[PDB]
Amino acid sequence: GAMAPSYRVKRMDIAKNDEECVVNAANPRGLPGDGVCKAVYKKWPESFKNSATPVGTAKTVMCGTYPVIHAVGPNFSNYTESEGDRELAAAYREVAKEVTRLGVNSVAIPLLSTGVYSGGKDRLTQSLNHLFTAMDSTDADVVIYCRDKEWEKKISEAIQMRT
Ligand SMILES: NC(=O)N1CCN(C(=O)c2ccco2)CC1
Ligand SMILES: [Cl-]
Ligand SMILES: [Cl-]
């Protein structure tokens, strides 16, 4: 566990994280994909061996000794708001289980279903609150990675409000 488990946010490429494992915003088929998933495929392509897993689940594949946790959020283009919300919460609960099982002291996480799976909505608060619901009971240092200065500020505000 981390000595004083914390949440932080950084606006940078999650493929250049400084944590003991990474969460991929994966597709269900284990394809290279685009956005975070493509950056993860270029950095850790060996982790895409048998990485296919259903929506609402996470599957860990090692790249050397570095764990890549493939977490499959729902595509809100396809899911109802209600079913999409259930599967997004479920994907984060499976991430918490895998982080615990691995025994890591830190994890790099993206906000699931906020990019091309957002169905064109702003889901910062929805996705972050499900991340907190799952990760609050873990003792790993969590570092959230984002790709927008306004998102960085809003995530940082949300973290600080609880402290
Ligand atoms: N995780 C991020 O930092 N992203 C910031 C850029 N994004 C948007 O601005 C966006 C897409 C749909 C509605 O807002 C995607 C999420
Ligand atoms: Cl970067
Ligand atoms: Cl996405």
Side-chain angles (χ1 to χ4, degrees):
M3 282 299 102
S6 70
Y7 290 107
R8 296 163 58 220
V9 57
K10 302 200 302 178
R11 182 184 75 91
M12 61 182 285
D13 186 355
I14 197 170
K16 298 295 275 157
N17 77 78
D18 195 26
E19 286 71 61
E20 290 184 358
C21 71
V22 70
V23 176
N24 185 28
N27 59 71
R29 305 183 179 274
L31 293 161
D34 297 73
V36 163
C37 189
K38 176 52 71 65
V40 166
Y41 180 74
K42 284 185 172 144
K43 185 55 67 174
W44 302 284
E46 298 94 330
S47 74
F48 289 67
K49 185 182 186 217
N50 293 306
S51 65
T53 198
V55 173
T57 75
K59 186 165 184 183
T60 301
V61 181
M62 308 306 297
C63 176
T65 73
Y66 189 79
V68 178
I69 304 171
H70 299 271
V72 184
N75 180 1
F76 279 96
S77 291
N78 294 334
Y79 283 88
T80 63
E81 287 295 335
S82 174
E83 198 66 5
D85 183 72
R86 190 186 63 68
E87 283 300 4
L88 179 53
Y92 282 114
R93 289 188 300 277
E94 295 304 304
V95 168
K97 296 180 188 170
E98 284 298 280
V99 165
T100 300
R101 182 182 67 75
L102 289 165
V104 291
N105 294 332
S106 62
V107 56
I109 316 193
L111 293 185
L112 303 175
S113 300
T114 62
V116 301
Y117 280 11
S118 72
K121 288 196 179 171
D122 172 345
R123 300 189 182 270
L124 189 171
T125 299
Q126 172 180 27
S127 188
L128 183 57
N129 282 337
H130 286 323
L131 186 161
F132 285 152
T133 299
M135 303 305 291
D136 278 352
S137 64
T138 73
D139 61 6
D141 282 336
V142 170
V143 183
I144 301 162
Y145 287 72
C146 71
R147 39 212 208 71
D148 178 279
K149 285 174 185 180
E150 291 306 300
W151 281 48
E152 182 187 15
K153 286 178 205 150
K154 281 186 281 200
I155 297 158
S156 181
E157 290 163 19
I159 293 168
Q160 294 312 135
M161 289 284 285
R162 328 170 81 210
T163 63

